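Exercise 7. Predict the joint structure of the components listed below.
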Amino acid sequence: GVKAKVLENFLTKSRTELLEYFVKVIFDYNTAHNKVSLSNKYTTASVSDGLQHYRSHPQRFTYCSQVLGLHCYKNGIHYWEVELQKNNFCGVGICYGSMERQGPESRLGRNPNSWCVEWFNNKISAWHNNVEKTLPSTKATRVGVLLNCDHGFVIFFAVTEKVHLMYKFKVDFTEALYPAFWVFSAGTTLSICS
Ligand SMILES: [Cl-]
Ligand SMILES: [Cl-]
Ligand SMILES: [Cl-]
Ligand SMILES: [Cl-]
Ligand SMILES: [Cl-]
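Solution:
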């Protein structure tokens, strides 16, 4: 019952307040799909023209152009921001480590093991468990993710002058979460903000 109270508090926090929970995210080399190149000390992920040299790995995505953060979060509260390149097809979210890495089930937001917001075909959508909800359009090119492991929720914010709520999900999480990302189409790039 007190989860609602904590959620309401976090929905009203300023960017400065959310940054008290800042975590440094870096992209995990062993998860990147071979169409995804990592650069800038593992803080930029881009769609590569040709295939990357990666060897197969049980954690590596082989169906969807995705990559995860290296660290997972099991307890406490965590906040990070991602800068998107204008007009790119891309997605920003969280997933359980037990999310599939092969097949259509590995796609972020299309299974019960992940939650995301996604820019695609000129729309912005929130996804979980293969259910999509179209969100109001915004010109924001930065997204903030507030993950609360203790009271069970994730909030997606559009970051411009201030933070603006995009969507939130309440969940009693059953295992640790990793930051999760999708990039698609030549030129698409996204970066973890400092
Ligand atoms: Cl894909
Ligand atoms: Cl943790
Ligand atoms: Cl688009
Ligand atoms: Cl809390
Ligand atoms: Cl703000």
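Discussion. Residues 1-194 form a domain with the Jelly Rolls fold (CATH 2.60.120.920).
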